[PDB]
Amino acid sequence: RTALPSAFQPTKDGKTKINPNSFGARMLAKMGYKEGQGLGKDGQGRNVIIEVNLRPQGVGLGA
Amino acid sequence: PEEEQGSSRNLDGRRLRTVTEAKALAEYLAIKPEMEKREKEARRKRWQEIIEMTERKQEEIRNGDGKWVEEKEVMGERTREAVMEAMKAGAWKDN
Amino acid sequence: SLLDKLERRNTTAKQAEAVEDSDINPWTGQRHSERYFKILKARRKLPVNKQRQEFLDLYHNNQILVFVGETGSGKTTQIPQYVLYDELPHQTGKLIACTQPRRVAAMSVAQRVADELDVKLGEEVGYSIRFENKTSSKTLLKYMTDGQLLREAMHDRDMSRYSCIILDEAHERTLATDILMALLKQLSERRKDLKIIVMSATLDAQKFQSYFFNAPLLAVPGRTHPVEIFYTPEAERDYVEAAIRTVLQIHACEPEGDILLFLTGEEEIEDACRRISLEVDEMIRESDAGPMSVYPLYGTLPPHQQQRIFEKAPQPFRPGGRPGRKCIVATNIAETSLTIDGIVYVVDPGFSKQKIYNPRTRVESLLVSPISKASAQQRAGRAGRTRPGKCFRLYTEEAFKKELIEQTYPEILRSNLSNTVLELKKLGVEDLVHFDLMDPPAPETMMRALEELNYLACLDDDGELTPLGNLASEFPLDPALAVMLISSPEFYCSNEILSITSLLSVPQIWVRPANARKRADEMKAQFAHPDGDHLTLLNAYHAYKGAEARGEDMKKWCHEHFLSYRHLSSADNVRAQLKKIMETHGIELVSTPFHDKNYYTNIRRALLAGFFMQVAMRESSNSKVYKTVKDEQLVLIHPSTTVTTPYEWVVYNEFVLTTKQYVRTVTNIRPEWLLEIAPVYYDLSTFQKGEIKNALTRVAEKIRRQQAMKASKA
């Protein structure tokens, strides 16, 4: 079996890029995924993952 | 504007800076005992934590690497392999 | 009979009420009791029976329906009984399914339905949970969790055994709930004979109708006691101090009534409880304030702690003085599905601990995030249950209107989708991106999940599910744990690896109380092993099994050794289920000898084969910081690790992102052993940056040179 590259490759800037040569990217392209548009029946899903906010401990809402 | 005209007077002949300073001293008298207590137990807790760090280092001294431990493991497996090849080839020369 | 007289999809509400009020119950040919009559009278008095005719008409006229109703209206219980009566499962042979978010809540709903229908639990009304299937062949209504529904869909996506499926508590937006909703939408698009019902308690009825393509929406009315909502004049930096001051002000000035405060963590809740106790003692000493009972309800509480939190408030010190109060500092338990009697005051700091899984480095964390408008509304609804209440928030009204989100983030975006992708592949969803999903995950997250499945051999390069992927989908565990259990037969440590996987699937059994930290550390050192945290957990499980065989009490032994008896029992049940699945699938169970010196090496090799993706290497000999190869993550070792000496390679079962990046549950392994276990993942030809991969390539070259020397000498 060929060594499939990781889908989320971390660059030098700290950002994770989606490698199109990955097995997961190839499977998504075969299924019908489009760049910049979410999946689903009508593409109404979120196109980005949920980012955790680094709020201070013991800090109220809106602070 | 009152800060600009702090030396001017009210209708009752009182300086606006004295009105402001009376209000500020009222606030200070309202807040002073509780912040005195706050800094008191702040000192207590802070140098109590300093103490606790000192006895945790004392206990660390009282009870006292990776390349080391995997070097030990690799020579152990290599010595075992030497043992098996030695009695596979018949290297009995003990005395 | 009543069921023969009632027609399928045409039964009237009056006919259903007459059948329920009849003295002969035809579910089992039995006689109605006084408790059953009282339950029927309560259901009739509830607002569900008032709209039961409209609900039956909507279910008859539409295959997919959404019912939005307030809590306590009876949508969880009265709707499924009426749905089953209209469906007439005796004339169809298919049961009714009730999808719930929590297994305990599903079991409670099934017990309530059985009590209302005057039938035994599991005979007519059944419950399905993880490793717990309390159902029989005569069951018509079965309450199951979202994960159980997903497993049933993976086993048979046709869903021929279920005629009508009602998914309740859809506002939680769980990943398994969303997968079940997508599967139900696909089943409704395929065959029109299946009935789909979505029960909601929020204002997302329009969104649910848009997801279900303009499904019929029925609204159940009904109000409760009033709650006055107050907001802070400004945002406070010290939420804990602001909550303590608000609780003190409510005790000193506000009237009698229990106060529930929103905390974030267990240690913070304990510190706030200690501070509140000291403040109440000072107030009793100086101003002679009323008594206050502090109760913690954080994420780590026992049943005794829950009972003490649910207990009554303390009495006043003197008659006619300040009345006693109960201050319950809860983290997220009291936000929803909690009924605390006497609760009048609510303190909402606006911060709560939520779990988020970043797929950029595949790191799972429990971080404090701002609360949502749905969470604030849930807290306001929880406050003032039996009487008028007051809820004060530590955020401005404009901040809660604008900065606070309307709904919380979903578990699909808060976790991974590898298990969902494996379940879809097992069910037959080849087009995962083109699958009919209302809220599908990100394409990058889906690609990462498929790449992880390909690395764990769950899917091929074309995305097709292989026999290993089918076995992993059949096994009720993670794909990595399934791969570890499959590869354990090669390492001849199948029983130990299955026990370790069961312990990893079960919650943490290590108990470290604040007042017994030294005893917990002594017990952990006594039951610990130098090979790794997984070896220490296996030794603790072996000691618990030996104590059970010797006849000591399991709970007493767990309390003496700072262990969790419930977690140990869950791990034992998971190990028994895994052994049964392995025996069904033909997987051999072998264990290395205790006197053999290769047992620990075989266990480490099996762990490396199972979890070679989460492997960390030390950056330097003088630095304790390790570098996990997953997106080059710089982390450390957790303080709960039992390894005194750090290893060259540490296989980590869990990665926790905090203020200090640490990795827990780390087992010792070598780079050569990791490369032998997973040559495809650790291939030097496809190895990226950096020096860790260079050292792995150097180790591979040394192994190749050793093999060449052995071939030359042989």
Numbering used by the authors:
A (entry chain Cb): 237 to 299
B (entry chain D): 135 to 198, 205 to 235
C (entry chain Cc): 51 to 764
Passage from the reporting paper:
The spliceosome, a multi-megadalton ribonucleoprotein (RNP) complex, catalyzes nuclear pre-mRNA splicing, where introns are removed and exons are ligated together. Highly dynamic RNA–RNA and RNP networks form the active site of the spliceosome through a series of compositional and conformational rearrangements driven by RNA helicases, providing the necessary flexibility and accuracy of the splicing process. To ensure fidelity, the spliceosome needs to recognize and discard suboptimal pre-mRNA substrates while it assembles, is activated and eventually catalyzes the pre-mRNA splicing.
We could resolve the ctILS structure at an average resolution of 2.8 Å, with the variable local resolution, ranging from 2.2 Å in the core region to ~10 Å in the periphery. In this state, we could clearly trace the U2, U5, and U6 snRNAs, as well as the intron-lariat RNA. The absence of mature mRNA within the U5 region confirmed that this is the terminal ILS complex. As observed before, TFIP11 is associated with SNU114 and PRP8 via its helical bundle and forms a coiled-coil interaction with GCFC2 via its long α-helix32. Similar to previous observations in the metazoan structure, in the ctILS structure, we found the DHX15–TFIP11 (G-patch domain) complex docked on a surface provided by SYF1, SYF2 and SDE2. It engages the 3’-end poly-U stretch of the U6 snRNA as substrate, which emerges from the U2/U6 helix II into the RNA binding tunnel of DHX15. DHX15 is observed in a closed conformation, resembling the ATP-free form of previously reported RNA-bound DHX37. Thus, DHX15 appears to await ATP binding in a closed apo-state, ready to unwind the U6 snRNA by exerting its pulling force by successive cycles of ATP hydrolysis. Taken together, our ctILS model shows a high compositional and structural similarity with the recently published ILS structures, suggesting a high degree of conservation of spliceosomal structures among C. thermophilum, C. elegans, and higher eukaryotes.
